[model samples]
Target: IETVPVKLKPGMDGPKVKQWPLTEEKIKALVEICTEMEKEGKISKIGPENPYNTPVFAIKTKWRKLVDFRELNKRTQDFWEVQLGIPHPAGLKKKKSVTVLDVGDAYFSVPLDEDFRKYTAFTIPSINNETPGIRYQYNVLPQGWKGSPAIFQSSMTKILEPFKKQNPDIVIYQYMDDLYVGSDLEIGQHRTKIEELRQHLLRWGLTTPDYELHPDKWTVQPIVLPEKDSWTVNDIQKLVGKLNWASQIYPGIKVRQLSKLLRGTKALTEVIPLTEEAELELAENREILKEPVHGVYYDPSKDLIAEIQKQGQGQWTYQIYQEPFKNLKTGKYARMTNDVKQLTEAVQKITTESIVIWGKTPKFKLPIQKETWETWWTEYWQATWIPEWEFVNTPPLVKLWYQ
Candidate 1:
């Protein structure tokens, strides 16, 4: 709904070029495309003769049109930081909570400023057999514009940052138009927050609420792999790309599943036969994909047991509990608040191989060790004598025979 200016830097000279020749079939399709865009008012035919031309080219393998605007690109600040502000899948490690805010279209959704239309002007190839002189310009932000990603990201940040500030329970990371909403709070709490978020987006005209914020719609479906026995080599290639993108969540997945699948793909249309092992490989990856990311917001005032599975020579392997325990002196059920002095040291000494955590639901990456619970056991009556993690596996009662 917002119209943003294309800020061309000082001494910026826009590029100009003639259209490349198109065959009869492609030319016909190109004409149809321009006509549709004109009808939708995304482009208006520009005026005058001998005008400058920003040439349109086949932007994608799908043969889409894009007016190249790299000349104006040199003038704008490259928002690399904003471009990389995408939420990390690693953050969702054990946190099995995620909500994706999929905007319908990215750059095109923003209306371009009127004065900048001239800078975006481009001429097309012959519509009929003649008349290559007709010029047209974009009314919406175009994909080929050098600053599209940064500009769109900045615009959405203006809208979503306020939403993030108001809702402390939700953690959001954005990649241009697609937003990954994550949370450390309880599962139900995250779902409730996302439902409210649906309303927020509707109010801001993002997705128009996308019908009702119902149970089915609110469920997490962050990753999806296609199911097809007759998948082509191109299919394998596309799947590899998606898996790589989601690899941050589990790079382990790529090592196990991608090698054979990618090695065999060659011809785009060639159908790769699905073997039993290949089918099983795909299925295993599919199972992992269906798993939700573990929620990270560690809550106190819940039952807790630091399950120590193994402790040996120089290291201890244990899992910290997320629930609350009681205050013995007050005899009151209290929040598991603490300064676990030993726990802090333990956290520092913690190694990936040594730490164990509960819930295989989405299988967390590492122990979610935050410094909030240090004081809980530090205030005990015999705090100095007792280890900070007192609830460890009860030391396993043992019997001894006389030697």
Candidate 2:
């Protein structure tokens, strides 16, 4: 039960956190505005809405080890009855034995740029800045967005449909885009079947960031977990320290980036140790409301922080979309040019170049020293592998020491 404080940002607006504090009367009035906007078609809350508690906690992964709420409700069910105080929910009836083959680390997001775009199956809409159409927009979802989970789940569902069609008894559960495939079959059979399933998913449009197929489904392998286990905080801390020390050999060590998980300073309580300079930088972040744009973000530079702090709230508009993933694949990683041959080339280049400088080394050894950046400090990288960025656990987490 390890806990990391949620970070808050001034311009951030979401169901979980309010951008600005207001009274109940203000909220009710705002709800009227929302209702009118709902009629205007700018906000699309897709799929079936569920309890705010379940989706948000599930999003933060604070709920069950594996939370499946999409199944339709049933009268005889007992799981949510005793604990959550809710009977069978609107969408969750019986907890079916769905196999979600959670591949390695769950992918929250990839970089947003033209080169990394991987979707070739859909029609590409052109960006219109004056009206700022759907093409120009990017999605960083809220807690209640109906299609957030489904958008990612659809990719997995599409990738595994062939196997799923063959085995109708097995249902796959994907919440917030983490894969969970369940079946009544034996674990060994499940693992073998899932590996074959994963291969096809890779061949198709879907790719797991870094995953751990459930033990029953596959052999036990080290998988990066989203939440650090709090019960053994010391052990986990030691493990992270040890891993960081060893993984310094890979290139791009000098200038490391932080994980986005550490980016939110306001909502996160862990950053209480920020330096005087950092405090000043954070103070500058308070200006985002001066301008109209509002979203949760952490800019490394003070200039960017001040710029975002002054954004006006009125200019911010909640755009409507049918799914969370407009173009899951295809962004800056897309290379249809003479120099670049395929999407993978574009992805590797965009990812590697965006963060650091990587020169080949014979063995996996970092040239620089580790321990320069504090753990759980900012969203800065601690020489750990970003499973989502690379989609493969080729390099493990390591901490380096240079004398």
Candidate 3:
């Protein structure tokens, strides 16, 4: 809700002029919504011209006006990164034990500072086809503002800070206006925490206490591949993209190799002929590599102590030792801290039950001693143990497995 100058590219001609000849229904919806916003003091009348002018475009799907700020964005390109991109829903395992909270009309809810409101000015067609239609500017943070996301994210961060400090064990992830709160606590505990969160938001005037904060919609449904006898260059490229996304959380070595076929092709006319056998092989790989569930967060406080105490009676005989391991991804020798619980959780993360689809519900299968897992572990870490991780109080079973 702060006024910031709209910087445009040097000598840039603003957004292109396009006539939005709306249908009767679209025109009515637009006028009605805009008039309501005006009455609510979200928008104000503007003069005919301004130094910085950007045109408005109609969103066909939503039948609403959208400010085209392409030129404005080009000048403010660096600002977009001020707020890092949306956070990935981290530790997707225990996806069912999460609550999603959202703010209604989030962007509009943030009032704009007076001086910067002029930058949002745009003219619409006259409802009566009279003189010039009313030119208007937003009184609140509007879409297409280059810095709006950063502003909103920063605001939410400040608002959620208190809750975060109080509940270190609970995972509260905020991406723009959507916040996901996660915990290993029981359903009642989760609901109680959620109610507390709702009251906090209510107190801050960020949202209503009645905002829906229930349910578990964590797992992304698998993509269904197209059944084509032969794939065009575009089709192959799209397939590669989809497979690459799936590989982020699923085993996808076989699918990764398929990228070679579409690697350098640039023409849509180019075709990768697929025989019946080849097609079946591709589909089989897709089915084999589907992610059964989202990855889980490895909470040391809960998981580590529980695992260690379970083996207190010596149910497990294996010992695990920690080593200064070079992670292939980071290409650095990961420092193994002297914390026994943290070290235990780290290994547990690398070695966990694989997710499997069992009927309608996904289930965790016992970890198997697979060559793939062994290879990955070796590649990511060395057996030369880091002395610092050694602890006399560490359970024998925990040390045996990590060793």
Candidate 4:
């Protein structure tokens, strides 16, 4: 069996995690799905033997096969490594035929190295409350593992490199499982050859391949990760890399402005001070945050807005409603907007006349329990297609206290 060579830091074999809470019906459903995968050689039986086990949960992925606890990926060694030098599409003169393919069951396609499979082991909760559930290990890459995207993409890159050299005229681009082919020549010239190698690019489709990169998702905020003030050279490199791509569409900003901050950083592992200019540059990023990064599109129907906010732990309010006239906003789903400051003042205006209500605008609130700022380190033309950014992945284990 093939392996991805997963190795861990000394004394840390892998994750030991608690199970994801699920009802008995869903639990039974997940178990049967695993048995199906087991029969297909995508998953295999294992004992409660290995300490390197994680609990499983359903993320509504294709009939809800089990997803690993974030814990397994958090402990996964540097399998999170791959670098693809993607060229921006500005230079092509003739806008000829272009094809984009989104691969299916990406993680399950590649055989997980048999020995490394031990590290991807997961626990299935029992349908019966009295007995503990069985433990199983992955025979192929697991969807939720941090390393899957990079691993799968890197595996394809090896396959594509040979084809790229032989077929110099045709250009192939990939972002995780999304493989794209762009050629100035008619696809008729190379149809059979491409079809032959299409076996390597594998299978699938993405309806809105010509989609825009949502700019606001690029907004970075102060967080507990890499600690609040101190930043890792690795993550800093990723931010600069992200900005480098953002510069393509958002003409207003330049990545060179933050170049000086990376002077002493030789490796992505060391921590660096968040310099004076770094703070100012972040201020500039906010100015273009709302603008569409990959230009615009027209949707056929109107999209409603919805959101929820928490006032207390595990307690909150959620409201979903229509907003001002907005039609076919962004992609397939209703566009989620935080551009509701008018709702704040509008609610303040209507209520005041009927029954006077007021509000206090206090000190700035830092978003605690912050999601880490990372795109898959893929050469996504707009730096967004990189998936599988696990919240548990971090700089170091020593967490700084929040004020």
Candidate 5:
């Protein structure tokens, strides 16, 4: 579809834009990586038909837009936010609409931010950082890009301002990158407005059509059956099945199954139930995703005995086994030798407390990449970009007792 414009609201701010400078060496590195990916078949070869990497996406309804954040959370805010650096934007507190044309023109139609930093202007502490190179990446839909929604809405508004102004009776609104141009006028009027919008969009370098003119499409609501009043293994199994209820809608949804990353509340229940029988079996343990202790395969060969030496044992504490411990033990014992009170503490003690674990940094530290620019550019075209989307969880009324 082409020329379907989502106008920005008046007084809305554009996101901060950053300029990334590419060095000759950095460019060479990206070329090398892209080339290597092509050779290894990790990415497709660049051609007129495929000029750049095209990350495929699915179209989600406005309601399902709220990502199930419970899966993202591990133990605490510090664990989820600071450590993982999840993009968490504040939810919409209110909603309003202005003449879409008036708003879009005012958005990016003016000055970009003065505070926006340029990549070429940044000073690196050393030249060594160059070989490893700068990386560029972005997120298209989710809330975490600091100014993604604003920049997206602004650019979209500018693109559609001419057509919208020309046809004042149409309706427009933006949600992240999706654009919807509509009106309550007669069906014929809607068709006329859309055709006119499409014509104007050619000037903005975009496109649209009639069948792309469907009113709305949606996903099946998950069946939250209360099999066990509150919680049980059956309930978890049902929830797991519910995950696939709409799998036909998303071909790649199975990729997320590795984390068992779906979970939520029914007002009272929080913990997911795992069968006690399943809990002890090795197969059940496979369901829980945890990072490897240390990626070492131990050998029992007598030839290796020559390299072993006793590092004198000091006063043993409960914490010592929580990390890399040695007189050079092997097998499962070498991986991890102790148990702990809390999962968070265990992770910190191993990752932060041990020099053996944190030592020997990689030859290349993956550079932080930003996806906001491209996300701002073509998000509206992504099938799932529904502008006025929302996910609701309405519970039945609760009776209060006064005793």
Candidate 6:
């Protein structure tokens, strides 16, 4: 059994406990899952008769589970990097195909340290006094433990090493359970590699792997900025999350520019003051928000004639179309022109140069050194006596040594 060390903050005890608000059906479902986990020796009974415990809380969204190890996370000097340095998915559309693999119940897969199991204790809701209730502790790596993510990620890296070695050309990105494998290959080629990657994962005990299509389903939506004169820490954090999501599909230059405002802050109530550069960036970003662009455009005959006349080509003549002609291949629409060849090249330039450019990701300067940023985050959390959840296991961004 692997004994995970848990160091509590000075003068602090253990968890402040609670249970999920569940109906009898939900409670029965929870108990069924718990029983199976226990039968597999992944969890076992704890007791009032036996005593030693930690505070636990339950959440009911998607699943019922305990959360936030405020004390343990604060004392432990740890950080995890989940983001892989790569271009956004929108950019990858032209260069490669992405195959995504989801590892099921990642944390629970790691065997728990038997001696430390008591710290993971939680209570089940009582349906009636006649049946009483149960207190249980994990025999496998428990969710919401401060070190769970880092531990699971560490194990995954080792598990994926063989695949990495075998397929050197494939680019791999992982955020815990969701792993993306990308390569500048045809869809058929990518799928072939995915099969090989699938084998590697199953051989390593992760049996469930899924290959996904369509970028829109997995990537973030458009970001709308806050409407305020001054920003609070919560507001800034929200903005950061939005920008972080946008970076998955848009350019990182915008995110890196906006992230500057997040530094040197302490509390949730702290107001952010925008500098001249930040103000200009915010205004430009707003312009982007106001006029969002997709890949295709429609140009009617009237508009096309007006454009040609404006360019001083009044002699140009073409029969007006009853309706705008749609390019079925590319989903764009254009009017017939006297100089059809010239119009074709012009439309191609606009589509390829202007619209397609935005779809690709742009490089940005790396803002902070890993160790420096980690230390700053730890000290910031410690000074405030807040849960260190804000800093740990964040989506990995490119860490530059010089920056």
Clashes of each: 20, 75, 13, 3, 10, 4
Q: 1-403, model 2: which lDDT tens digit per residue?
A: 1211222123422222112222334334434543453464323343222112111011101111111122111111122223222111212112223344433222223212221111100111122323211111112222122233332343344556788788776545443333455555566776666776777666764565332223222111121222332313333333334334323322111112122223443442233333345333323332321222223232322111000000122111011111221111111121222221222232233222222111110111111122321111112221111212112223322221110
Error of 6 at 118 (Å): 2.4
* Comparison by TM-score, 1 against 2, better one: 1
**Winner on TM-score (5 vs 6):** 6
Determine the C-alpha RMSD for candidate 1 after optimal superposition of all C-alphas. 24.9
Q: Estimated TM-score per prediction?
A: 0.36, 0.24, 0.43, 0.43, 0.24, 0.44
Candidate 5 on 1-403: residue-level lDDT in tens? Answer: 1121222223432222232333344344445544453454322322222111112221122311111111111112123123323221121111111111212222222222322211101111114354432222211222322133444454566677776677665556443223345465556766666566656765665433222232221111221222343444344554445434323322223323422423443433354554444233323223321212233333322111101111112111112221132212111111222121122122222221121221110111111122432222222332221111111223212111000
Q: Pick the candidate with the highest TM-score.
A: 6
Models, CA RMSD each: 24.9, 24.2, 21.7, 19.3, 24.1, 21.5
Residue lDDT tens for model 4, 1-403: 4566766544665776666446676677778888888889887787767766676654332444545445654455233532322333332222254444544365677777667778777777765467777778877767666566556665566667877787777655543334446565545654555564566445332122211111222221211212246677777776676566455435676555467778863777888777667766755664564454433332213222323232332222222223322211212111221223322222222221111001111111112223212111111112112112223223323221110
Candidate 2: which stretches are off by over 4 Å? 1-99, 102-146, 152-157, 211-403
What are the Cα lDDT values of the candidates? 0.49, 0.28, 0.48, 0.47, 0.29, 0.48
Which ranking of candidates, highest lDDT first?
Answer: 1, 3, 6, 4, 5, 2
Candidate 1 C-alpha lDDT tens digits along 1-403:
7665554555655556655554555556566778888998888888864255665544222344544454444334233223333223334334446555555345667787776777777766675557744578888866565455555776677767778789755556543334557676667887777778777776776662131111122222245677775878787777766666556554345534544755742778887776667677777777786665454344322333343232233333333334322111000111221324344344322211111121111111222233333223222221001112333324333210000
Ranking according to TM-score, highest score first: 6, 3, 4, 1, 5, 2
Off by over 4 Å in 3: 1-33, 39-41, 51-78, 83-89, 92-94, 97-100, 104-116, 126-131, 143-146, 173-177, 180-192, 208-403
Total backbone collisions, model 6? 4
Please give, for residues 1-403, the per-residue lDDT of candidate 3 as tens digits.
3454444345654443443333446456667778888998888777756545555544433444556554454445344543344343445344446665655345677776675566666666654565565577888876665456555776777778899899877766643334557776777888899889888987887664152222243233244556676788888776666655544445542554456565673788788776455465577766765534334433312211111122232232121211112111100012332223333334433222111010011111213223333223222331111111112333334122111
List where candidate 4 sits over 4 angstroms from the true fold. Answer: 1-4, 77-106, 158-403
Question: Among all windows of ten consecutive residues in candidate 1, which has the lowest summed lDDT?
Answer: 325-334
lDDT of 3: 0.48
